[PDB]
Amino acid sequence: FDFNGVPGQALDAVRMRLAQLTHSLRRIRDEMSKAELPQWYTLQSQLNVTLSQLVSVTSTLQHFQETLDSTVVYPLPKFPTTSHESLVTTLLRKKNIPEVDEWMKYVRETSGVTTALLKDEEIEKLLQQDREITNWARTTFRNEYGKHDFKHASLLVRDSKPSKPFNVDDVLKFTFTGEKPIIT
Amino acid sequence: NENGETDDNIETVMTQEQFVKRRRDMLEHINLAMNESSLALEFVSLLLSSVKESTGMSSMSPFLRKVVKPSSLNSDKIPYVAPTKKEYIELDILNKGWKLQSLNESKDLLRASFNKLSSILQNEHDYWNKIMQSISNKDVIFKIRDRTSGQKLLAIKYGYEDSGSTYKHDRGIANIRNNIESQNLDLIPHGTDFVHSVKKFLRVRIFTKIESEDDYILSGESVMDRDSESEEAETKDIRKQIQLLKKIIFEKELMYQIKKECALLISYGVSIENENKVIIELPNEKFEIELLSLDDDSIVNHEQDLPKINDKRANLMLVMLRLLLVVIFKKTLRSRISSPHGLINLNVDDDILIIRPILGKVRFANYKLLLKKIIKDYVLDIVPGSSITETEVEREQPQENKNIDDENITKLNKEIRAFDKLLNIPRRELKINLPLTEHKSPNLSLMLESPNYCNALIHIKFSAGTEANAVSFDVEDFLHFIVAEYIQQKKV
Amino acid sequence: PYIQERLKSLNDIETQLCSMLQEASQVTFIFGELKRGNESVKPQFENHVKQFYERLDKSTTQLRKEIQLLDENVGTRLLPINVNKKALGQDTEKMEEQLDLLSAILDPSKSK
Amino acid sequence: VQQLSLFGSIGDDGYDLLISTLTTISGNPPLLYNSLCTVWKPNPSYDVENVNSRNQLVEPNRIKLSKEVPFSYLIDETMMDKPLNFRILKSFTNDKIPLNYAMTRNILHNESCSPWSLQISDIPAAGNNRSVSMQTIAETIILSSAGKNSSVSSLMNGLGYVFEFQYLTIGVKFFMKHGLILELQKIWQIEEAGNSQITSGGFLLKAYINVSRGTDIDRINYTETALMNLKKELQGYIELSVPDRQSMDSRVA
Amino acid sequence: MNVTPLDELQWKSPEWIQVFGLRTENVLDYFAESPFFDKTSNNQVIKMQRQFSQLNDPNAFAYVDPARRQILFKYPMYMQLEEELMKLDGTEYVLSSVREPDFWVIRKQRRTNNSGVGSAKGPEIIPLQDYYIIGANIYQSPTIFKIVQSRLMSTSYHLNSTLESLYDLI
Amino acid sequence: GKSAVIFVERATPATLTELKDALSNSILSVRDPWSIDFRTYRCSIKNLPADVSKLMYSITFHHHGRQTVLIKDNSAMVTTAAAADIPPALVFNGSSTGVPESIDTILSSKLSNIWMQRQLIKGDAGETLILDGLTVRLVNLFSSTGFKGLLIELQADEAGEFETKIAGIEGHLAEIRAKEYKTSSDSLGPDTSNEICDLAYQYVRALEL
Amino acid sequence: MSNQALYEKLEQTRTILSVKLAELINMTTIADRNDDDEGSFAQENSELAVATTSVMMVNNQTMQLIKNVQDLLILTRSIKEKWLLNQIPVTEHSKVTRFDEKQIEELLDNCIETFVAEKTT
């Protein structure tokens, strides 16, 4: 009633996937340090392969409320306890890119574009769409591969198996009591 | 192919600094993303507003000490519009084609080094072809793994020697292919040298010291086993390697002569210093065969051809002594095939052991010299006109050779039969003998028994007449005396 | 033995798989040119592409077939029964002992 | 004695193969053997409590006399002849060797008697899920006999037992690692009104180890393992399993 | 040519001489942030507009608030300005008033936070849509969640792919 | 092989030595000790009337092998508890597990419902006296109720005139003042294909009163 | 048995089939395919994460493809091994025994014995 219901609707949803990507990384990080022995190339792909999967769900969880969250755009106001020790606040509320943004430029400049505007750009879009349509051609060729199939029970059993000469248990029953083996 | 793909899937490497620095790269470059996923865990405290929010918050120890629920937002659904609708946003989607393009450039590059990585695996396809060629049919497909670990590491397959029946220690074979398209024969000890490195054949050697009883001059003569010193076992040829495998079998056989060495230890005939043992026997002083408690036959000598009478005999020894422990190698397997426990642990009472080299020594020496000596004592009965004869008769009475009777089974019966005819050789106690008279008729008889080169002479005698009189007695001193007493109670 | 044939059929299926790789690798670099708007080799793109599909479908039938064959070989008493690598050593060797030493003892007794 | 064991079966079809396989796994040939078992129950005319002079709850059980029959008393044809047991078993399938087995029970063909294996077994070890069948056996060897009524039948009557039923078994056994035995076997009911093969159709498979201990949990646990390894090694070729206990109880029934 | 874009530094020491101590603080921020664009300053200039008298013409019982303003509650001269700002920018409805481009603040002791906003009112609810800026020691913070995430998230992943690139180990 | 058994009913621990020395001259060698366990099983059967019999005797010898003779109504069964003494063929084809135990163990523990062990006489550290054509064994018999008496076992190779050998020893018994003693060589009737069983058996005749 | 072993291989093959397709199809989506049509259901919105799809595709698809390959080369050579495990080879002169087989050998041994051992009769 004093202060407000600010934001964070799907924030819980981000936190959960934020954590799982943290949790899978953290554990790989802990092992990463026992470089005394690497865990079994199976083991690391199990942890680093679902650890990458974790970031797909964490990647997507971001877009799903993606309209909502960049719109929310909360900047912090708090206890002045946050003001002492300072930086933690600069650090903890800061968005940037690392040395990262740079190979992002290497990549952007690696494309064939940059300052030539709208009309020529719309055209490139239609052209890339044509590439995706030529990719449908993959659908046609996949039909050719033509490999899809399956692995009456009675119909299949005659072909497969006639196994068993008798009842093991009953045979034994006889040997011990003289009770005789009845049809199985 | 699978083993080699599994090798590449073992992380395995022997790199100094090269291997070292690389793994440090993993540590730091992975750690960075681990640590930045922790900023992700800090957005968790950023919720606040709820108890479950506090739970998420404690994620930082600094949150444990930064109490506040701190932050708040408003509405710029308009700014969401700007993010989506900007000409900048249309353009940014170009950063999507751009990074994706360079990712496809990476992808292309990775894909090509892959087919060339399958090309080093074609070296292996060739190795399997090499294995397909050459040693085939009956032969070991032993599959092994070494360098420990127990999973992955280094794993491969091959055959070895001993099999049915048990010498016991250090016995097998292990085989791999070099880049010269030749197979190297490992042994899991017997240390690798393509079709061996250095080989010891069993060897033999028999000396006689006579001089017509002159100056105590001894010479030897040795039955020699040398197929050649020149070695072929051609590279790229497992057929030549099959020959090398047969050589391997011979090397395993010498290990058997080590068991015979041990079986010597039960006798009083030469074992000197515990460092060398020499096989030798008293009469005409002679020596027969050798191989040091260190070993058997190790190759390095000049080669000239002259033979000698001793030498011819000596080749007969080796085959016997060798043969005799195929017997052991056989009566071992009798028991094994036949009854539950298995045979393991070799020659208790040095009864089983002793057979090798023990009964050959005995045989030669004992029965023979003693029979000769008995014959001089029977020259003490050389006095009467008389007559007296020797048979295999003791031999005939026990230990029959290759009999139709068999044992418990058809399968069992065969092996029993195999034992029996060879069993004459192993059994070789002295047969024994007799002498007789007619005219109101008397009769006597004696048996020479070797028990392990010790000689008993047990005799009998009956003087058959209208009313019967008889005696039987079972030491050579007394035998001389018994013969003297017999002269008196004979005719004379 | 004559199975060395079936062995070589599979080792060749192995080279077929290393072709699934080698071929689709071009598919990677060639689709690189294609979305780059330069429709230059679009027919050639289609070629090496249905070719990666072709190599793996041939490998897929060939090793699938080989597995069917091995099951058939297993059904046959030609291949050893379902199970394990174990000793052949004991058999021939045990007896053969004699055959060599005996034949050689014969040889030193009379000859030529 | 403790008998740990696993059971299973193969049609005569599978025999040839199984054989070639078992020889390789064990490295010994199969060895031909047989045995007759004669089962006895307490004389139903007498009647006795289930307690001792040492107040103990003691149940009536059957006795089992077992021994070899030399094949000369068992085999139908010399033409078949040969030493090979598996090809020979097809010759034996469905129906009986000479038998009439009564004859031997009381001598014939003024007489003393043979050696027997006199046994009595208890139901296999109670167990919720056992990895292996574990059974106790009390045995003594009879060496020969003496006295007025020295036929094995007289002896058993003297002791207060009565003949119940009998069976012959012929098979091959494999001698294997750590006292492991494998029997591939066929069983024939023997009655006076003719003989029928209990195992008609195939072979009873028994893989076992008799252990001297019982009270050495370790060797017992080692033995479990051995059997397990076997079942496991042959898994996907033949399942060795634990028979139903109830089916191995020679009690009154 | 480069931009400082998604908030960066201050303007510092230059109105530290003019002196920052609340209320004056807001105006110091104006020079600093380079982010007073229309209404607050416009209000400033119009009053500031009268110079040396040329000719320049055209037309141009206490307690009542906003929900956020009621939550806030203003203490001293900035409270007076607040009245002025409402006057400057108020779309008027029956029991409601909405503002155009006013810039304003919330604070404590060493530091505060200020927003430039649009208010929509009603009897039982009222929201201001704006930009919010925090202001400690001559610096302004203006940020966005979702923008906030993309941050160390893409960073985590580029660094994980450095990690994945390092799996160039046999 | 022939045999006879003598039981000195009225005796003490010392009676043994008295006779031991009365023969101290007539000795050749003395071999290793022997032992013997003599059990009495009362049958548990009431359904069978007093018209036919009851009771079975169980005699375990330590004559190298842990062999046991059972005797009921002049019929004798021979068993072994020693694994070594098993007929080889029984073991091979699986008839035997090769794990025998004493037939008595079986009787008392498995068929205890039919048979109750009534008496258990043991003879420990017996002495083996060797003459020419007559081996003479001696031992003191103890029950769970105290000393029972002295026991003499006579085994001889010589089927020739065993009758004199027995009579002579009974003489030595008169000398040492051994009065009220019991003797058995069987009762002319049983036939021996395995004589040892019968000899071991007679004990029963000497120990039934 | 053999069946269970194969099932795995079949699954691996299916995996290998399904991922050059994802590399191709995801190529479209990676290259970014923003649609004027509202019906189309592939997304590439947010900065980092939509080009991150491109970094994940790389590692995922390319290693799943190559991995299906590595596993399938294992599969291949596994069967090869299976076949070099071998079968029970029977004897070539069985039923027709070679060498001096018989008591005949008993004679041979006696010869050697008299030969090696001394005395001249």
Q: Measured between alpha carbons, how far is E162 from E154 in angstroms, rounded to an integer? A: 12
Which residues of B are less than 8 Å from D183 in CB distance? Answer: none
**In Å, how far are B25, B57, D142, D201 from D96, measured between CA atoms?**
79, 85, 28, 14
Pairing of strands E128-136, E139-141: antiparallel
* Among B434, B25, B186, D189, CA closest to E162: B25
Which residues of B are less than 8 Å from A7 in CB distance? Answer: 72-73
Residue with tokens 């925090």: E134
Domain map (residue ranges) of chain E:
24-143
Q: Is G103 on the interface with D (CB under 8 A)?
A: no
- What beta strand segments (E) does chain D contain? 2-11, 31-42, 63-67, 116-121, 133-147, 161-175, 181-190, 195-197, 202-211
Q: Where are the alpha helices (DSSP H) in chain C?
A: 4-34, 42-75, 90-109
Tokens of B345: 């642990």
What burial letters (b/e) apply to A123-137, b meaning 16+ CB within 10 Å?
A: ebbeebbebbebbee
Domain map (residue ranges) of chain C:
4-84
Q: Measured between alpha carbons, how far is E128 from B337 in angstroms, rounded to an integer? A: 97
Q: How far is C21 from chain D (nearest CA, A)?
A: 34
Tokens of D25: 């796994």
* Among E2, E46, E1, E12, CA closest to E135: E12
Which residues of A are less than 8 Å from D204 in CB distance? Answer: 168, 171
Identity of the amino acid at B387: S
DSSP code string of B331-356: HHHHHHHHSTT---S--GGGTTTTII
Angle between helices C90-109 and G104-116 (to 10 degrees): 50
Contacts of B327 (CB under 8 A, 6+ apart): B355, B419, B422, B423, B425, B426
Tokens of B77: 């659904």
Domains of chain D: 2-248 (2.40.320.10)
Q: Measured between alpha carbons, how far is C36 from C42 in angstroms, rounded to an integer? A: 11
Provide Rg for chain A, Cα atoms: 32
Cβ pair A4:E71 closer than 8 A: yes
The one-character DSSP state at B358 is I
Q: Measured between alpha carbons, how far is F5 from F151 in angstroms, rounded to an integer? A: 7
DSSP code string of A77-114: ---GGGTTTTTHHHHHT-----THHHHHHHHHTTSS-S
Phi and psi at residue B3, to the nearest 5°: -55, -45
C-beta contacts of A97-100 below 8 A and 24+ residues apart: A97/E151, A97/E154, A97/E155, A98/E155, A98/E158, A98/E159, A100/E154, A100/E155, A100/E158
Q: Is A14 on the interface with E (CB under 8 A)?
A: yes
Q: Nearest residue of G to residue A141 by CA position?
A: G21
Identity of the amino acid at B438: E
Domain map (residue ranges) of chain A:
1-98, 113-147
Which residues does residue B219 pair with via DSSP β-bridges, in sequence order?
Answer: B208
Q: How far is A23 from chain C (nearest CA, A)?
A: 34
Q: Measured between alpha carbons, how far is E67 from E126 in angstroms, rounded to an integer? A: 5
Which SS3 state, helix, strand or coil, does residue E78 take?
A: helix
Angle between helices E39-49 and E24-33 (to 10 degrees): 110
Q: Measured between alpha carbons, how far is B21 from E1 in angstroms, rounded to an integer? A: 39
Q: How far is D3 from chain G (nearest CA, A)?
A: 30
Q: Measured between alpha carbons, how far is F202 from F184 in angstroms, rounded to an integer? A: 6
Q: Can you give the resolution of this entry in Å? A: 4.2
Which residues of A are less than 8 Å from D167 in CB distance? Answer: 174-175
Q: Measured between alpha carbons, how far is A73 from B79 in angstroms, rounded to an integer? A: 9
Q: Is G62 on the interface with E (CB under 8 A)?
A: no
Cβ pair G4:D236 closer than 8 A: yes
Contact flag for B and D (3+ C-beta pairs < 8 Å)? yes
CATH number 2.30.40.10 is the correct assignment for the domain at C4-84: no
Tokens of B86: 């900007």
Cβ pair B73:E145 closer than 8 A: yes
Q: Measured between alpha carbons, how far is A77 from B58 in angstroms, rounded to an integer? A: 20
Q: Measured between alpha carbons, how far is F82 from F61 in angstroms, rounded to an integer? A: 12
**In Å, how far are B163, C88, D201, F37 from D21, measured between CA atoms?**
17, 12, 20, 51
Out of E145, E152, E167, closest to residue B40 by CB: E152
Phi and psi at residue F59, to the nearest 5°: -115, 110
Q: Measured between alpha carbons, how far is E77 from E22 in angstroms, rounded to an integer? A: 10
Cβ pair A29:B30 closer than 8 A: yes
Q: Measured between alpha carbons, how far is G84 from B476 in angstroms, rounded to an integer? A: 66
CB atoms inside a 10 Å sphere around CB B438: 8
Tokens of B447: 């048996």
Contacts of D30 (CB under 8 A, 6+ apart): B411, D19, D22, D23, D85, D86, D172, D173, D174, D184
Q: Are B174 and B189 in contact (CB under 8 A)?
A: no
Tokens of E169: 């180990």
Which residues does residue F69 pair with via DSSP β-bridges, in sequence order?
Answer: F59, F78
Q: Are B44 and B57 in contact (CB under 8 A)?
A: yes
Tokens of B378: 């029977």
DSSP code string of B267-295: SSS--BTTTB-EEEETTTTEEEEE--TT-
Contact flag for D and A (3+ C-beta pairs < 8 Å)? yes
Contacts of D140 (CB under 8 A, 6+ apart): D118, F79, F80, F81, F100, F101, F102, F103, F106
Q: What is the CATH number of domain F2-206?
A: 3.30.310.180
Phi and psi at residue B345, to the nearest 5°: 85, 115
**In Å, how far are B63, B418, D66, D111, E45 from F89, measured between CA atoms?**
84, 21, 11, 21, 124
* Among E103, E98, E92, CA closest to E130: E103
Which SS3 state, helix, strand or coil, does residue E17 take?
A: coil
Residue with tokens 């680093």: A48
Tokens of B217: 């001059």
Q: Is G90 on the interface with D (CB under 8 A)?
A: no
Which residues of E are less than 8 Å from G63 in CB distance? Answer: none
Distance of CA B85 to the CA centre of its chain: 82
Q: ∠D207-D210-D215 over CA atoms, to 5°?
A: 135
Q: Measured between alpha carbons, how far is B160 from B140 in angstroms, rounded to an integer? A: 7
| H or E element, residue A66 | helix A66-72
**Residue G112 belongs to a domain:** no
Which SS3 state, helix, strand or coil, does residue G93 take?
A: coil
Environment class of residue D52 by beta-carbon count within 10 Å: exposed (0-12), middle (13-18) or buried (19+)? middle
CB atoms inside a 10 Å sphere around CB G79: 23
* Among B361, B266, B369, CA closest to B317: B361
Cβ pair F90:D117 closer than 8 A: yes
Q: Are E110 and A83 in contact (CB under 8 A)?
A: yes
Which SS3 state, helix, strand or coil, does residue A119 take?
A: helix
Q: How many domains does chain G have?
A: 1
Contacts of D184 (CB under 8 A, 6+ apart): D10, D15, D18, D19, D22, D30, D171, D172, D173, D174, D203, D204, D205
Out of E134, E151, E158, closest to residue A95 by CB: E151
Q: Which method was used? A: X-ray
